[PDB]
Amino acid sequence: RRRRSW
Amino acid sequence: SHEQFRAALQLVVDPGDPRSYLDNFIKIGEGSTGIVCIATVRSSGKLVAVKKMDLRKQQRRELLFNEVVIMRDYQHENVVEMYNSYLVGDELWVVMEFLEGGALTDIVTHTRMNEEQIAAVCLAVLQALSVLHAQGVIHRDIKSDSILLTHDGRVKLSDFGFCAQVSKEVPRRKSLVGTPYWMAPELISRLPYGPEVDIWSLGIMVIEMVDGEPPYFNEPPLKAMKMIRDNLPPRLKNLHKVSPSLKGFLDRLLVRDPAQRATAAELLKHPFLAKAGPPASIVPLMRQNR
Ligand SMILES: [Mg+2]
Ligand SMILES: [Mg+2]
Numbered sequence A: 001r002r003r004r005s006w
Numbered sequence B: 001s002h003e004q005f006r007a008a009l010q011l012v013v014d015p016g017d018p019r020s021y022l023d024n025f026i027k028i029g030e031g032s033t034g035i036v037c038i039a040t041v042r043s044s045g046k047l048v049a050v051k052k053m054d055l056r057k058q059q060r061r062e063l064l065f066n067e068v069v070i071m072r073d074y075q076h077e078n079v080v081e082m083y084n085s086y087l088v089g090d091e092l093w094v095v096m097e098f099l100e101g102g103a104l105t106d107i108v109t110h111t112r113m114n115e116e117q118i119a120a121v122c123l124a125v126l127q128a129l130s131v132l133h134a135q136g137v138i139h140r141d142i143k144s145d146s147i148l149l150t151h152d153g154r155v156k157l158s159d160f161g162f163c164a165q166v167s168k169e170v171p172r173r174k175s176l177v178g179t180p181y182w183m184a185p186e187l188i189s190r191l192p193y194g195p196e197v198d199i200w201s202l203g204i205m206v207i208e209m210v211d212g213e214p215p216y217f218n219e220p221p222l223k224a225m226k227m228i229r230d231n232l233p234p235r236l237k238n239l240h241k242v243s244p245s246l247k248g249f250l251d252r253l254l255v256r257d258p259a260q261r262a263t264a265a266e267l268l269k270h271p272f273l274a275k276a277g278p279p280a281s282i283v284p285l286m287r288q289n290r
Helices: B002-012 B061-073 B104-108 B115-134 B196-211 B221-230 B244-253 B271-275
Strands: B022-030 B035-041 B047-054 B082-088 B091-097 B147-149 B155-157
Touching: B002 B061, B002 B082, B022 B047, B047 B061, B061 B082, B061 B091, B104 B147, B104 B196, B115 B155, B115 B196, B115 B244, B115 B271, B196 B244, B244 B271
Parallel strands: none
Antiparallel strands: B022 B035, B035 B047, B047 B091, B082 B091, B147 B155
16 A cells, blocks of 8 residues: 555 | 756756745645745835745656746646746746645535535646647646635645646657546556546545545545556545536546546536536635635
């Protein structure tokens, strides 16, 4: 459930 | 090479140190590229936001040039205003407009938006994208976390750190960029892509506004990406909770073939947007009011 950008 | 880059940035940013004119820095957010503080302008008592990004902690340092120039050169009613940028020790600091209503994520994870509210958000975002895309700017990280609000419910696009430009000489981008659950299928497939990727990501945000989360959100990111790449467009968890108008709109965004996906310019004419409320209709959704 991670919202971090790549 | 870090020293090499610090020197390069110094040539592009404003001279000086905003610590000379700002007081009472308080951290309000943690991003993928750094942190965001509120600060008080000593002379005015006005509040600003300060995004601080450590040059040593970036995957691609050269992307920081987006933080220096995009907000400053591509201004719009629905895009966060930037004031100044500075090199402060090992960090790039951008002093920008404070969006005191916070991020759309805090609303979508805590309440249910009606279609007047969803349409108001979509209209504001599409107005920004139509202008950016006409100038060849692709945002590449559209999601609720990138949409910020004023106290009076105005909606603004933020976080251009990962954007890119297309033009006649560089008609498509190739970089793997974005947030896994929101990424366009052609981008995941590593095909050359354009502004269309932002429209797909907007469709995923519409699903956030309806369902509270993007599709496959409980899957590991890599697995979610495989599923986006390989599967039919993702479906709403609750189709009965959306009008045929909102379904028809979404059907123009979540199109696998980028050539058949609606453009921002085209979507501004969609009958779903006729439902958009004024910024006031957004106000009661925010934490300070609900
Ligand atoms: Mg972010
Ligand atoms: Mg970012």
